[PDB]
């Protein structure tokens, strides 16, 4: 039970990492960059 709970909690909390992008949040990236530049930022988050 503890293993399942820990796995779920870690999966939930893994979203805080931004990998190689500029921010973990996706709203601000689209709020300051053009889509041609935002696609590169979104791709690494998707892969991670």
């Amino acid at each position: 039970i503890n293993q399942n709970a820990i796995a779920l909690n870690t999966l939930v909390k893994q979203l805080s990492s931004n990998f190689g992008a500029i921010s973990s949040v996706l709203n601000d990236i689209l709020s300051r960059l053009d889509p041609p530049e935002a696609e590169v930022q979104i791709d690494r988050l998707i892969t991670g």
Partner: protein, 559 residues
Amino acid sequence: DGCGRLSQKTQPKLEQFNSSRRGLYYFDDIFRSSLRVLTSGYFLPFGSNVTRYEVIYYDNPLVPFGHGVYFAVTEKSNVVRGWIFGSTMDNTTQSAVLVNNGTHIVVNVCNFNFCADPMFAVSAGQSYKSWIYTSSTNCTYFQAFTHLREHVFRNVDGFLHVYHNYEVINVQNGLPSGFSVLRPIFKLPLGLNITYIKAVMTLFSSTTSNFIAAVASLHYVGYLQPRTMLFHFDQNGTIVDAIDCSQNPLSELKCTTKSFSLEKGIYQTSNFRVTPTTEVIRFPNVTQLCPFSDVFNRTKFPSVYAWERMSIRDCVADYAVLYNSSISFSTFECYGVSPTKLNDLCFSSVYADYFVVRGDDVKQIAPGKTGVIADYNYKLPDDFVGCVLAWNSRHVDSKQGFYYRLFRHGKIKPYQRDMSRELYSPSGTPCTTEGFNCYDPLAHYAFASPGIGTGYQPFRVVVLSFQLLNAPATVCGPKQSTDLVKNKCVNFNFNGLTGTGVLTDSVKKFQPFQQFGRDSSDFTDSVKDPKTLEILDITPCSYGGVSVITPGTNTSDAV
């Protein structure tokens, strides 16, 4: 050739049929054979609110174009042969006319003066006048119920796409149901602003006058909407079936599996039912422009070695006012933020630096570069966020007294001022007077020799730096608020924070100097309204899970 008159005005009648499962077209030239692809775009939803018009009965209302218009005609004879495209339907703005007269197609883009009731004319079973317009101004472009024709009109990137389809039906009244596919024919390039679409139809008379609508025809209009659909391609590539993934609970389950048949069991589905339509924009209400004149029309700029800093706050930033002025920037680069979206943000700490440099030294005011200015005069941090502006001032700054630092032991840090005058010695030995082994650190810009080159001309440089989404903002773009909507999942924008979700009420207590509510997963949940000074709540439009039980495709369709 002039235009006729119709004093009689019968009130138009409006009825509501449905489009069944029609209004599909080849959305791309990519040849797909024997596969299924899920594509999103602007299509006609199944079972739409199609409208019918008839033809004294003469209805030619101004139909808004929107994102696209679906046009289908049912007739026994050629009576409908053209359409009118335009924005104001006058001679002030250009308009497009497409009619069928001869060899290929008659299409014209011009400044027309349409009459009240544009129409064709056929007398004694032969061609007659063309009472559509009466004047053609300065224009460029020129190029030359058993019947059911369907046309789809779309205008994107200045291209007008036309789709055609022909079918044979025998129905006295009512739009027939079934499946139809349209193939593109025209890709006419013309840059216009299409907002309204009209139709032109022929009228018949006996010899020359007393035109009457002897022949009646039925045509339907449909509005395209943003929908997600799944398509199937045969070996030839012809579309044979499709599903609109918003109609019934079975539709989204079928779309998720990416198939056309289902097995008995229970499956999990995604969200394909609710889409926000309302927007909630909120900005703090202040009204005052920045002192653009005080920074772009300051009669005195210092040298680069003595650059000065200015603070900007409590503004409504508007870069469009700079167009009216007589300033022509020769360099405009931005780092971090895109220049396109500079009017939809809220800056938190704006600072400006101004000085004078040589014409060939403008390039050295970028981060990560080298040069005497970048080493001893002015350096930018590697994480600089802002924009750089520069312009020529050969007519105000053709004087003497400007200097730059030439000799210095170390390299200055970013954002550092080194206004000094002490003597310099390469060996580090202290000096006592200017002469041998002692030189003046500063050097002159000349700027007084007649007939100097472009690279040696004086230039004025202004650097803007700001921070985003860390502290409460004082400078924001020129945007107006649209009050507050409750109990709906909508698209909000609070000081440049796009999001989606329901907002009803909040009871959370927090500390001042706060504008956003974070989370352990970096997902926004609360926000402070800058206009009502009260906290709100954000919750996604979809929260729970949905499962659908089906007995099989052969068995039945009830779920």
